[PDB]
Symmetry: C3
Subunit: 127 residues, 3 copies
């Protein structure tokens, strides 16, 4: 197994790595909507969902996989009242990559790192 | 890898599939207590826990596995004060299937889809 | 696949096992900061984080692996305001084991079993 490290997702400053490549299975850390170019977080929940998904994509692609290889996500949100918006963005993201939708779990948590509105972790497979 | 799709669990309307069959490992989406026959959610927390477990079972069985093949679950609840009840139902469900209990994580979240009281995701293996 | 059962982590009284050994992959149950020798929970959040990590370590080691084989954790906390402290302890724990940091997801939940401040689940691999 090996660490996945890419400039295309926010740098792993704390005691974690961006993701792990286990051979057939890749697992990402929970991605928050931090822009890897600027370090900023967009205000808009739809934009946050998209930034988190782009961060997941960067890690999966750094391991040689595609968005279409993602088979399971967990989506942690700060407010389920914004879920229609998140769902629309999430759906669009997968559609843009001609990807079958992953299996998913979705819950509203009390708070997320940096007070973001969403955090998404993903599992992808080579086969 | 392939999608698991069964009439025996609530249809996957949003941007997700019910579960994924990765070869040896099967992963389900987080199941909420929606009845696949009627679309209704039972009021009772014990009944909700059982409906979620039945939904997990439907997906695992659609992949050719048994409840006894489930090795890890995550149980998200709306209120840990109802956990004795949930635990009793969960225990009964596994016992009914002559199944070794899976590894498990349990947390109280702020809110769940459709305001349900429980959501359960599961991992099962063929070997 | 087989159950992992060790006297070195709190006994699995409810309907769960401490962890599962799936061959290459080991998955633990969500560990809470209960001391396996006394059954008590330390007051201090740093001490709680360390007790949870020690419990994870006991299960991983019972399967023949090391802390350095842990590749993904999920850390559920009661209060993200205590996260700097948790992070410091978590970092120290991995460093003490000369371990590459795992991938990680971190969220604040509404409540945890026994009103603890942290629960940590982990995935480790042999290869």
């Amino acid at each position: 197994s090996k660490t996945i490290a890419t400039e295309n997702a926010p740098a792993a400053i704390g005691p974690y790595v961006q993701g792990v490549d286990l051979g057939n299975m890749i697992i990402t850390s929970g991605q928050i909507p931090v822009n890897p170019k600027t370090g900023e977080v967009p205000a808009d929940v739809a934009a946050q969902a998209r930034q988190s998904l782009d961060n997941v994509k960067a890690i999966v692609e750094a391991a040689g996989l595609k968005v279409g290889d993602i088979v399971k996500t967990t989506v942690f949100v700060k407010d389920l009242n914004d879920f229609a918006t998140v769902n629309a963005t999430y759906e669009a993201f997968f559609t843009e990559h001609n990807a079958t939708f992953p299996a998913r779990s979705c819950v509203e948590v009390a708070r997320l790192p940096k007070d973001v509105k969403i955090e998404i972790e993903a599992i992808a497979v080579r086969r």
